[PDB]
Nucleic acid binder design. Structure first.
Ligand SMILES: [Cl-]
Ligand SMILES: [Cl-]
Ligand SMILES: [Cl-]
Ligand SMILES: [Cl-]
Lengths: 217, 212
RNA sequence: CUCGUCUGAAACACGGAGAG
């Protein structure tokens, strides 16, 4: 199974530097071109840089030339993006993508990693508070409110991932305070509310915050 | 560098419709054009490469075509799972460049929201803030109006809304509205109501509770 | 050797192919 796993994202001060890693498995980057592509929140895909196999030639978008440096370590089977003099305009999800095999897919990028968010801001990290949205007076809705955190993102799961049907985790909204807030809800049978427990699991990696919140009637 | 101009920026079409997305290159890119599909919050996936070749595993309803510098992505019979943003990309010249994307919405029958209201938790009330949440579940179309009333007084300036992306199976939306008050203001009033207006509702639906 | 081309896990450099 081909996999690309980005890491190294997070909060960085304007003017700061940060290195992203793209760890490949299931194939060797020595034989493929590897590309970095970024996507600012709500916006389009933007090509950033690439590195070619056999030659190790490197190429850059004009908006990053002179500030970013792409490289690869074949023994570690990992590609890197060194980012210097970061600005707010560089805030984005950064994806690593494999350009596929020429005979099979031309120059298309045939496998993409999940992406890692880079936030360029002077604001301080802040962990969330998690509050229950309790069910009350056929179907019942319940959820959890994840309030007052920075930066993005948070991951919410229910019953440690056993429960996905009926779940809606809403996009975060930026409050007037500069802190994010989001809710996650799930609809469940009302006949089970007295015997089926429901726990919302919240992880805010930037602040090393993990919270499980029981949601009861 | 080579500009890829993509049109339209968004479209809405019914299941079974033929959808066509266009991308014009600012100079020749030979046939070195790929098309990707991106579900919200997900990694893009390759659909078409070399302008007209279908990437293996992709359904045959997707096709690509080239005419000079104009490139087209066609979905011959749209399905609910085709909700996505679609991007063209040229690989003829470094720097590679992407089109701005086309957001494709699935147009389905009208569906009224199920409305729920949640009082603030006692845990939150221990601090100085009270959040009241109104949930609009599984509706279409996306336009919906939520109004908050406290003791029948219309609220302004103190709520925020978020909407989910279109569901890839039933083509509906859900929406959360959060009213934020100081604990003092929450304690000084009794009736909390969210009034919902939607094309699926013949009259506005109000869900309310009494503090206590 | 050359290439606004193709191929070798390969947009450039390199090997091979094709044409000159
Ligand atoms: Cl904190
Ligand atoms: Cl098929
Ligand atoms: Cl033309
Ligand atoms: Cl009272």
């Amino acid at each position: 199974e081909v996999q690309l796993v980005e890491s190294g994202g997070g909060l960085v001060q304007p003017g700061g530097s940060l290195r992203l890693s793209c760890a490949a498995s299931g194939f060797y980057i020595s034989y493929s071109s590897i590309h970095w592509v970024r996507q600012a929140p709500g916006k389009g895909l933007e090509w950033v840089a690439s590195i070619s196999p056999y030659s190790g030639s490197t190429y850059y978008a004009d908006s990053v030339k002179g500030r970013f440096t792409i490289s690869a370590d074949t023994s570690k089977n990992t590609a890197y993006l060194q980012m210097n003099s970061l600005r707010a305009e560089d805030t984005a999800v950064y994806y690593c993508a494999r350009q596929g095999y020429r005979r099979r897919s031309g120059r298309g990028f045939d496998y993409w990693g999940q992406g890692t968010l880079v936030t360029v801001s002077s604001a301080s990290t802040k962990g969330p508070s998690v509050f229950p949205l309790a069910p009350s007076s056929g179907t019942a809705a319940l959820g959890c409110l994840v309030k007052d955190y920075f930066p993005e993102p948070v991951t919410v799961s229910w019953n440690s991932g056993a429960l996905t049907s009926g779940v809606h985790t809403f996009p975060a909204v930026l409050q007037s305070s500069g802190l994010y807030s989001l809710s996650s809800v799930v609809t469940v049978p009302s006949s089970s509310l007295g015997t089926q427990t429901y726990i919302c699991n919240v992880n805010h990696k930037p602040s090393n915050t993990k919270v499980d919140k029981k949601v009861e009637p | 560098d080579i500009q890829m101009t993509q049109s339209p920026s968004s479209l809405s079409a019914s299941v079974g419709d033929r959808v066509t997305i266009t991308c014009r290159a600012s100079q020749s890119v030979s046939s070195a054009v790929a098309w990707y599909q991106q579900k919200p919050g997900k990694a893009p996936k390759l659909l078409i490469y070399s302008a007209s070749s279908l990437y293996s595993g992709v359904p045959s309803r997707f096709s690509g075509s080239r005419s000079g510098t104009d490139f087209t992505l066609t979905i011959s019979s749209l399905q609910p799972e085709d909700f996505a943003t679609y991007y063209c990309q040229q690989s003829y010249s470094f720097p590679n460049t992407f089109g701005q994307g086309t957001k494709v919405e699935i147009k389905r029958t009208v569906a009224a929201p199920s409305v729920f209201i949640f009082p603030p938790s006692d845990e939150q009330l221990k601090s100085g803030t009270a959040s009241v949440v109104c949930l609009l579940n599984n509706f279409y179309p996306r336009e919906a109006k939520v109004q908050w009333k406290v003791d029948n007084a219309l609220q302004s300036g103190n709520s925020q809304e978020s909407v989910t992306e279109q569901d890839s199976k039933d083509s509906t939306y859900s929406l959360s509205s959060t009213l934020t008050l100081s604990k003092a203001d929450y304690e000084k009033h009794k009736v909390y109501a969210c009034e919902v207006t939607h094309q699926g509702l013949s009259s506005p639906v109000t869900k309310s509770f009494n503090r206590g």
